Amino acid sequence: DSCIQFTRHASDVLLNLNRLRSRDILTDVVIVVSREQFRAHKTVLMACSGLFYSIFTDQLKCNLSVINLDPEINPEGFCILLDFMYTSRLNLREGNIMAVMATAMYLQMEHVVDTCRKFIKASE
Amino acid sequence: DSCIQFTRHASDVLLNLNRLRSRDILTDVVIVVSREQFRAHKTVLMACSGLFYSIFTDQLKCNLSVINLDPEINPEGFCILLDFMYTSRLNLREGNIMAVMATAMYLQMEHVVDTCRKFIKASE
Amino acid sequence: WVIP
Amino acid sequence: WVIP
Ligand SMILES: O=C1Cc2cc(Nc3ncncc3Cl)ccc2N1
Ligand SMILES: O=C1Cc2cc(Nc3ncncc3Cl)ccc2N1
Ligand SMILES: [Cl-]
Ligand SMILES: [Cl-]
């Protein structure tokens, strides 16, 4: 087509979605991790994670207001990944890299799994 | 902080939100324009438009599944703006620029209003 | 704004 | 990935 494109549009949209999350506006699901609860928007979770995409396209699960993650999932690793989904920023540290990678593998967040693998290979 | 950032994350999120819109997945509102109906996600509309932000933060309107726009709003101008919200791409043409600018002013989409003003000033 |  |  002959469209023009606003370079900062996608980043501005994500920033506003994160502001709605912070203020708990239109959040439609609670993710339960080892008795730690995280409120979010189903559509953002689906846009970022192959696991949430599969969960919320399921005819029965699409209607659930609570999702319980596998007990092996670490709440801090989840929290870091949830922050990444809404900001593009990943708080990756020596002390959390193993939990973050295991959580990203479970959530099916391929780009996060890739950078964790590379950061681990650099330390060996 | 000491975060790393994935450059393409925001664009990938928006692309996936547009794919959900195309497949009518988790759309939670119908926008009615001169008897033309557009399905969308309330959160994306709020992230892009000052008007939708004000509508869906209102305690009564946040719960509506149908929103009727002012009868002066042109469906094509709305359609072009809805596409912009989900893609960052604006199909701005000599034949639609007046309708697009009037719709962007009503929807409170300041960056769109700005480029329309500039494109009109160049033609005078 | 840019030409994509 | 970049340093923001
Ligand atoms: O690593 C990843 C990130 C990711 C996101 C999604 N999401 C969607 N895919 C396609 N159309 C719509 C949506 Cl919402 C699916 C798989 C994966 N895998
Ligand atoms: O031009 C524009 C675009 C736009 C978007 C919004 N959205 C939000 N603002 C702040 N926190 C959350 C959200 Cl969702 C408000 C005003 C305007 N004005
Ligand atoms: Cl990812
Ligand atoms: Cl805008």
Short description:
Chain A is 53% helix and 14% strand. Chain A has 124 residues and is an alpha+beta fold. By secondary structure, chain C is mostly loops.
- How would you sum up the major sheet of chain C? none
Return Rg of chain C in Å.
4 Å
Strand content of chain C: under 5%
Q: State the strand order across the main sheet of chain A.
A: 3-2-4
List the total number of helices of chain A.
6
Number of strands of chain C: 0
Q: Which outline of chain A best applies?
A: globular
Give a short account of the largest sheet of chain A. Answer: 3 strands, mixed
User: What distance lies between the first and last C-alpha atoms of chain A, to the nearest angstrom?
Assistant: 49 Å
Subcellular location (chains A, B): Nucleus
Protein name (chains A, B): B-cell lymphoma 6 protein
Domain BTB (chains A, B): 27-94
Report what the structure shows.
The complex is a heterotetramer, with 2 copies of chain A (124 residues) and 2 copies of chain C (4 residues). Chain A is an alpha+beta fold. Chain A has one domain (1-124): Potassium Channel Kv1.1, Chain A (2-Layer Sandwich), CATH 3.30.710.10. Chain A is built from 6 helices and 5 strands; from the N terminus they run βαββααβαβαα. Chain A has a 3-stranded mixed sheet. In chain A, α2 (42-48) crosses α3 (50-56) and α4 crosses α5. Chain A is globular. Chain C has 4 residues and is mostly loops. Chain C is elongated. Chain A binds chain B through residues 1-7, 9-14, 16-17, 20, 25-26, 41-44, 46-48, 56-57, 62, 84-85, 88-93, 111-112, 115, and chain B through 1-7, 9-14, 16-17, 20, 25-26, 41-44, 46-48, 56-57, 62, 84-85, 88-93, 111-112, 115. β1 (4-5) of chain A pairs antiparallel with β5 (89-90) of chain B. The structure holds 5-[(5-chloranylpyrimidin-4-yl)amino]-1,3-dihydroindol-2-one (2 copies) and chloride ion (CL) (2 copies). It is classed as transcription. The entry lists the keywords transcription factor, radiation damage, ligand, transcription. The assembly is tetrameric. Crystal Structure of B-cell lymphoma 6 protein BTB domain in complex with ligand 1 at 18.12 MGy X-ray dose. Chains A, B are B-cell lymphoma 6 protein.
